[PDB]
Ligand binder design. Sequence first.
Ligand SMILES: CCCCOc1ccc(C[C@H](CC)C(=O)O)cc1CNC(=O)c1ccc([C@]23C[C@H]4C[C@H](C[C@H](C4)C2)C3)cc1
Lengths: 245, 262
Amino acid sequence: ESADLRALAKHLYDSYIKSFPLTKAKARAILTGDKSPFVIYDMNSLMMGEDKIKEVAIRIFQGCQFRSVEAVQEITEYAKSIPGFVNLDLNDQVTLLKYGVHEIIYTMLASLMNKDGVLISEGQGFMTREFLKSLRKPFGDFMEPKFEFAVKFNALELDDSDLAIFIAVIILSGDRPGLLNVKPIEDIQDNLLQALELQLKLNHPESSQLFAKLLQKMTDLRQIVTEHVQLLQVIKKHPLLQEIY
Amino acid sequence: QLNPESADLRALAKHLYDSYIKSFPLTKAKARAILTGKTTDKSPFVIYDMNSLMMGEDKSKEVAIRIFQGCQFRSVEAVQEITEYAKSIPGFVNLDLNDQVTLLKYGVHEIIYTMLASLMNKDGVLISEGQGFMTREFLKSLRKPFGDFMEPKFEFAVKFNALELDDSDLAIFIAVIILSGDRPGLLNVKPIEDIQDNLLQALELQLKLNHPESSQLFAKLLQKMTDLRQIVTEHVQLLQVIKKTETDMSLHPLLQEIYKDL
Ligand SMILES: CCCCOc1ccc(C[C@H](CC)C(=O)O)cc1CNC(=O)c1ccc([C@]23C[C@H]4C[C@H](C[C@H](C4)C2)C3)cc1
């Protein structure tokens, strides 16, 4: 029973390394200690950034969109390495990804955040929190909720081996609307839940009920997403490019 | 074996169940017993249409409104009851006054909708201490915006009731709901988290022992917290609209203080 669960843990972790270029391990190294990133702290510093790495605030947002679409391909490859996933009804796989990705993006985005800013482009840059907060409405509020969540989320001190399994748990959520066959999704999630429990007990013996606390964060994650999606539609204020993004 | 520290957790379990039973009149057990015909004396008058609604009133303005005004005052009671239960949670009354208020402000609706689920099945919901049963479709027939305020509540109830929890499982879970450390504006978060740590341990155990054959009930239950939170967010939305269309509808000042800047 409990050796199957380390396999699953190990399998997911290795797949997490293959699929994601910038790991929490690597992200944490850059936010702390020889090859620092370029800091974007104000209007002028963002200018030289493009030189290095319509208007300012729109050009940032679009940057998040290119990024996001890349992420979605990374998350999709990962998912397909989660056992059982690819033997599910295809409409469900697409449903699971369609509804899961925002939740995964802001989870892993936390890896790239401290209470002062977020690392960008493979950790070549850092965009400060108070700068993003200065951007003209409605963009100034776009990232603060994410920052508020990353503070809370990062306090759990999870590492990549923990996060890998968590992500799979998010993917395999059997409450997504319009799913045709929920049984095996729940069956896989149960198994992922067991693996996560054990992982967190063996990797963080001293953190009591870390499993519980981590799952509780799901509640804040989904608010984050609903809120952000609202913002997006409100934000409707190149043809073939629109289509991509 | 069960060990000394799990002994303490089982004790916490008992205390809480007992307080739950003392602070809440209609338990899930009474609810089920009414809804599933264990009954020649406990059967409810069913409301499902306008005349039956009229016939029910032995046991004024207009209907959709009169129903919501009823929900208002019953929720006010519930807040009292939950406040009573909260006091009994070891540690809660010792916290900073302001946090006490904060935790009830955000806990209360999530607990109401957890317990409303015990009084529901797919076809309707018990009302008035379980003497009446108001059908789901009758509620849906209510005029906009009111035919929309309870569906989301049913969708959750049928999902939630599928976990098959009992009052002794619910007592610990509602404690966990109240003592949550990521509520906005709390002064001191560590104390609250240490209490929840204990509550979560107790729950984890109670579920294992009470439901030994169900895999990961603990987790599955914690996941339902996201559903509650979305029910509460959507509810508050809908209040906003009611206030604007019905300029003559009174809201209770207690409930208004809870909704204020959620
Ligand atoms: C164990 C805790 C039970 C808590 O019950 C409820 C709590 C809250 C709500 C929604 C409220 C809306 C303001 C809220 O979420 O704040 C809705 C409910 C459920 N409603 C009722 O229990 C209820 C419904 C109708 C009535 C009647 C009784 C009688 C006179 C009048 C008209 C008609 C005949 C229905 C009210 C009384 C209670």
